[PDB]
Design a protein around this ligand. Structure first.
Ligand SMILES: OC[C@H]1O[C@@H](O[C@H]2[C@H](O)[C@H](O)[C@H](O)O[C@@H]2CO)[C@@H](O)[C@@H](O)[C@@H]1O
Ligand SMILES: [Mg+2]
Length: 540
């Protein structure tokens, strides 16, 4: 048992038993592992676009093909071993040695690494991919060479890495089937050097069966920092004194593009024309209005986050020319012409060869808002004669399905999160290497194939972010393919659900004090949620 006034209870991102703390497997690692235990070279702030120096004291392009990091002086692993340039070197090079490591692809465009001293890392690139490099700067955890040095590729990839040895503000304390506990590392270098200190001695990641459970926890003050979707926000504020980012609708920040991935390898979902018909049959308005009660924004056919820097590169003409809209009569007309007609009289269209068509549509059990949205979609598909069958597997199975591509229709917001570049969005959708992967963690979960996109993705990647004209043109070419072939159908912008209660901790950020992004998802703590810990104050 932990002293309540020195413990902060977080929930919203833990939907399976804690069973993995491996920095090399970010898809399985318990939320907080990267961020609270492992650190990155930079923080990234979605509120501003700022890269704030963490392990790195500075980072600079020296010329077009050479990037230099200079580490802060006085960084230490938790076992008092100095964290140096060779740890950063190792973090990259281990992935050239063991190609199974998820970022081994970096060595296709990174040539080599130099370390002139204990603080300096120089990356020389053969093909500098600026967009993806910017993202690595705040997402790639730095790992201890002295710990991983002697491990083979199988250990690295399969180890659960209990009690991770990192450099961050917390260590793993304890866990069970329904919670992860972190304990603050008092001798953290970060406090000595940066002068910041996380206020809670204990951070507990709470696992819960369903969003509905979270509400009770919040009302009784058993949850402090909630990323769970919950309905009736005005009533939550007025009656139960629960707070959100904005005083007024939409109440929450937007964090993701929520849409449907389709199995592009399964007939008839393999037909671009059929996929278009699905897209034209779905009206997100009732989802936005009724499921979320206006706490989210509807997406246009391209699906660029309106609050993101992707809008800097918005291919306006392309969307107006090639985008789809809700148009069920035209959806029926398309299906007719393709020969998808009802021959047995059950209201559902069969294949041109008279074969029945039934498509599973899925999201995790307990994600109440997506379960409702899915039935809205089922009901909408019903009236154009498409038989969609709702399926709500455990989260663990939902993700296994996603990674293996074992689904028909899948509601998805994995990898479509706000970022420093629209490249992350197009990469998540088109991820060409999914086609050669049993497990695709990165994207293109339905295994869509296209001979142009890989070249287009690379060309975008290697274009300096300040060449607005060229980045925009490439977003247009990529967007054009997206809108024409619809491997992913954008539907709305996911709410960054963030609800707090002040009986134990105060000084949360909100629209009047907008100092940090409030996201406790795995691999997002370095975008603001850790910073929130630096700023929390005990309640009086
Ligand atoms: O809104 C659906 C559920 O989202 C959950 O947060 C997700 C987020 O949508 C996204 O999928 C990201 O990759 O993982 C997050 C953490 O699991 C929860 O907010 C849940 O309460 C919502 O029902
Ligand atoms: Mg029929």
């Amino acid at each position: 048992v932990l002293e309540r006034n020195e413990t902060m209870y977080y929930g919203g991102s833990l939907w399976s038993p804690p069973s993995n703390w491996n920095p090399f497997t970010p898809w399985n690692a318990v939320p907080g592992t990267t961020g609270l235990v492992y650190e990155t070279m930079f923080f990234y702030d979605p509120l501003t676009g700022n890269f704030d120096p963490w392990l790195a004291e500075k980072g600079e392009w020296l010329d077009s093909k050479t990037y230099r990091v200079v580490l802060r002086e006085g960084i230490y692993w938790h076992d008092n071993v100095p964290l140096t340039s060779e740890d950063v070197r190792f973090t990259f090079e281990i992935a050239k040695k063991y190609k199974g490591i998820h970022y081994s692809s970096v060595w296709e465009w990174l040539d080599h690494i130099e370390t002139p001293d204990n603080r300096t890392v120089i990356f020389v690139f053969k093909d500098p991919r600026y967009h993806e490099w910017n993202e690595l700067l705040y997402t790639l955890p730095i790992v201890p060479k002295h710990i991983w040095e002697e491990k083979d590729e199988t250990t690295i990839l399969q180890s659960s890495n209990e009690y991770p040895l990192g450099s961050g503000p917390y260590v793993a304390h304890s866990w069970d089937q329904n919670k992860m506990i972190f304990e603050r590392f008092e001798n953290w270098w970060g406090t000595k050097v940066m002068g910041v200190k996380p206020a809670p001695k204990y951070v507990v990641i709470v696992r819960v069966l369903s969003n509905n459970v979270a509400l009770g926890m919040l009302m009784k003050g058993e949850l402090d920092f909630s990323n769970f979707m919950l309905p009736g926000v005005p009533i939550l504020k007025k009656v139960y004194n629960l707070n959100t980012w904005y005083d007024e609708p939409p109440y929450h920040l937007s964090s993701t593009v929520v849409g449907l991935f389709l199995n592009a390898r399964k007939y008839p979902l393999s037909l671009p024309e059929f996929r278009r018909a699905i897209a034209m049959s779905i009206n997100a308005d009732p989802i936005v209005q009724r499921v979320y009660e206006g706490a989210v924004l509807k997406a246009d056919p391209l699906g660029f986050l309106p609050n993101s820097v992707w809008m800097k590169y918005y291919p306006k003409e392309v969307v107006e020319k090639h985008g789809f809209k809700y148009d069920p009569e035209e959806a029926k007309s398309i299906l007719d012409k393709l020969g998808f007609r009802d021959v047995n009289g059950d209201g559902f269209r069969e294949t041109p060869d008279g074969k029945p068509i039934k498509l599973t549509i899925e999201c995790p059990y307990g994600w109440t808002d997506w379960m409702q949205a899915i039935q809205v979609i089922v009901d909408q598909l019903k009236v154009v004669g498409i038989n969609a069958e709702p399926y709500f597997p455990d989260s663990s199975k939902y993700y296994e399905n996603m990674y293996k591509g074992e689904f028909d229709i899948e509601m998805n917001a994995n990898g479509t999160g706000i970022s420093s570049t629209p490249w992350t969005y197009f990469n998540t959708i088109f991820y060409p290497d999914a086609l050669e992967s049993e497990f695709s963690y990165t994207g293109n979960y339905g295994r869509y194939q296209n001979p142009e996109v890989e070249s287009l993705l690379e060309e975008l990647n290697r274009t300096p972010l300040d060449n607005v004209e060229k980045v925009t043109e490439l977003c247009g070419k990529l967007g054009e393919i997206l809108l024409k072939d619809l491997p992913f159908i954008p539907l709305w912008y996911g709410a960054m659900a963030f609800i707090t209660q002040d009986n134990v901790w105060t000084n949360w950020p909100n629209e009047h004090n907008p100092y940090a992004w409030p996201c406790g998802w795995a691999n997002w703590w370095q975008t603001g949620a850790l910073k929130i810990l630096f700023n929390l104050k005990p309640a009086k």
